[PDB]
């Protein structure tokens, strides 16, 4: 009682009647699912994309640049 049922929307009144099995992910729509699968291989080498934070050698990709600042993220170069 006083829960959403498995697979469907939960809010902030209605939490999942199975909280330690399922759970309310941050997403546009939250689901009473059971948690993620497994965190795929590491990603490939490559340039920091907009939005990646540089600092461990990392060098922002053509066009791209990161400010100067305690965690810079890459932007495309005003």
Known sequence: ???????????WGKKCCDLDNFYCPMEFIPHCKKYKPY?????????????EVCGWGSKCCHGLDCP???????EKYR
């Open 1 to 11: 009682g006083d829960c959403a049922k498995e697979g469907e929307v939960c809010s």
């Open 39 to 51: 965190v795929p291989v590491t990603t490939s080498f490559n340039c920091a994309k907009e939005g």
């Open 68 to 74: 100067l600042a305690f965690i810079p993220y890459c």
